[PDB]
Symmetry: C2
Subunit: 260 residues, 2 copies
């Protein structure tokens, strides 16, 4: 039950799940709702690494906003993007303190869910995100996309290649995911399934496009197949809980694979 005080055998490895995605893709909604789903059976901790957000739908165990917020920095004269970068520059003076706090959490909880800066570039291109990721034990990254971006074959290539680049940059296993699938018709869902998950098939379709862009997509997609095995993809809805069972399975499978 959610109201149970679940016990974690201290030091028994936890599952650290890190949600990453462009601003508005659903990281925060997913963090809260997936955590609520897990709370029935597991001891869950939440980490908020976003300095921007006004209201969280979960109760954070760690909340970087207690140190500084973007809104506070803007009151000092910064523009919003200037303030975002500055908030993470300032947060770096507390890096070891936050890192150590998260490590403590991983020892005391079954799951640690980490909700990242609202702009994924703040997480990928700032030392704070990079250094954190380097120092966590086998975190699982779930990279969520908004299906609205996926209109033509080349778009599927773009999103899958981006996921590979996140893996490269963060040095962590990255699961490509769609969020907001509740907004999709069954016809829409099937189209996405055709192109988004089967890379051999996507590659084949890109090969048919004789244009410069198609050629490029075909080369990148083909390289991707050789640089990365198959990989399971997720179709999630942070609103309806669609795909949560799938995510939970993948996390447990990653858990088992790690530490062997």
């Amino acid at each position: 039950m959610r109201g149970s005080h679940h016990h974690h055998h201290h030091g028994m490895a936890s599952m650290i799940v890190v949600f990453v995605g462009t601003a508005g893709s659903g990281k925060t909604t997913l963090t809260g709702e997936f955590g609520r789903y897990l709370e029935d059976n597991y001891k869950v901790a939440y980490v908020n690494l976003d300095t921007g957000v006004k209201e969280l739908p979960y109760e954070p165990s760690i909340d970087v906003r207690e140190f500084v917020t973007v809104e506070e920095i803007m009151r000092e004269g910064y523009g919003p993007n200037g303030a975002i970068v500055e908030s993470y520059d300032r947060l770096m003076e507390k890096f070891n303190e936050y890192l150590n706090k998260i490590l403590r959490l991983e020892k005391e909880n079954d799951y640690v869910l980490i909700d990242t800066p609202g702009q994924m570039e703040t997480f990928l291109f700032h030392e704070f995100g990079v250094r954190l990721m380097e120092n966590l034990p086998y975190p699982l990254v779930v990279y969520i996309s908004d299906p609205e971006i996926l209109k033509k074959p080349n778009d599927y290539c773009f999103v899958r290649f981006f996921a590979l680049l996140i893996d490269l940059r963060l040095g962590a296993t990255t699961i490509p995911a769609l969020n907001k699938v509740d907004l999709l018709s069954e016809e829409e869902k099937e189209r996405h399934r055709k192109y988004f998950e089967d890379i051999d098939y996507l590659t084949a379709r890109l090969k048919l496009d004789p244009s410069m862009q198609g050629l490029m997509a075909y080369k990148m997609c083909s390289m991707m197949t050789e640089v990365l095995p198959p990989v399971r993809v997720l179709y999630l809805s942070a609103k309806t809980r669609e795909g949560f069972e799938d995510l939970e399975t993948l996390a447990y499978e990653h858990y088992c694979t790690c530490g062997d």
Copy 2:
């Protein structure tokens, strides 16, 4: 000699240069300063596509802030990241207006410099930026990085492949560049240059990393070597004008190759 009024030959294709990079990398600084550089000889127009910035170092011919700002949206109750996205959703309703204004500038100026949203993901992951790029004549994208992100061998891989991804996404020739190189010691400068300019050296360095991510970069870099020849990385300073001569030459060469 800011008082010059250079003439552009009507019927003459302009050069469109688009600056893209993560927040804080120097897009706005570079736009203004490279513009000021070009203004010695050319009729230059500036397009600001960023809804967030409070003050520009150049005078924009087109400025999306006249329609809406992130700050205005925040006054409505939005947090900053919610407001950034909302700003572009609102602008999209006026896409044709802005596309058409930019197309007009391109007929009337030698150079049109486009300063993109402060957050690169707004440009690459929002309809506004990708639909704009699809509709511009042979734009040159300059993708700038802060040298401070180049901490290890795999970072060089990352930058090269990120530029490739941008080229795919935007369908435009993308030049990778470092900005802020004025901040670099002479050793730092040569190290970066070594990894970017000596692909086999880079790949060999990647080989030594026994980490699980080591092998990936290794595998990739070596496949890039094969199928997608490494484009020359530019070294710029928006502060000191380092690299500006190089950028202007590449822009003209791209222009010639496109005409």
